[PDB]
Design a binder for this molecule. Structure first.
Ligand code: SF4
Length: 207
């Protein structure tokens, strides 16, 4: 049952976000600072979904505000997509984390499939509210949330996907999460960035 009873009977994003602040649909609300709902408006043609709010997002109250979000901004701009026209969110809405002694940040921990499924009523509410033409799935957790737990992002780069149990039948494009592009050898980071731009352009060219 997960988050389902916490989701109000409205498509209004402000009302949904306020209700998500009270969600206890899995255990992640306990240690997180606050729920981080998606950001953007219901006229958005492109929805983008990451894994979870990270350390910076958990305190900003907004998605994609840390280093991964700044890299995503650079890729969006290169793809000539206006971020203000997107609806951006995450598969789960509370930050799951630990700390290491001497660390500079809280370290994100992978949501279990159980947590993803518990939080999915919020994602369905967002998709029903926004009616996107295309959904960009950033990373394995988000892609699996809609495409199935066995789905491999690495095996379907550049492909427009469609699955029948997604409400509205939007196009789906699964790509690497921007956090994966922050570190590594220079030429591999550069090739990976170009690939993210490519996938964003595929999504933007839908219809
Ligand atoms: S992660 Fe999702 S289901 Fe879990 S408590 Fe937070 S909003 Fe609710």
């Amino acid at each position: 049952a997960g988050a389902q009873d916490f989701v109000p009977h409205t498509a209004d994003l402000a009302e949904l976000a306020a209700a998500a602040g009270e969600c206890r649909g899995c255990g992640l609300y306990r240690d997180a600072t606050q729920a981080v709902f998606g950001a953007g408006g219901r006229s958005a043609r492109i929805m983008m979904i990451g894994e979870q709010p990270g350390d910076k997002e958990d305190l900003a109250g907004l998605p994609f505000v840390g280093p991964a979000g700044r890299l995503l901004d650079r890729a969006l701009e290169a793809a000539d997509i206006d971020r203000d026209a997107l609806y951006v969110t995450n598969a789960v809405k509370h930050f799951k984390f630990t700390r290491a002694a001497g660390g500079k940040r809280r370290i994100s921990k992978t949501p279990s499939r159980t947590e993803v499924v518990a939080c999915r009523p919020w994602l369905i509410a967002e998709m029903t509210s926004v009616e996107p033409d295309v959904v960009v799935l950033l990373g394995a957790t988000a892609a699996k949330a809609l495409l199935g737990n066995d789905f491999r992002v690495t095996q379907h780069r550049g492909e427009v996907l469609h699955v029948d149990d997604v409400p509205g039948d939007p196009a789906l494009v699964a790509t690497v999460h921007p956090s994966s592009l922050l570190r590594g050898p220079k030429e591999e980071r550069e090739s990976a960035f170009a690939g993210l731009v490519d996938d964003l352009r595929v999504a933007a060219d839908v219809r």
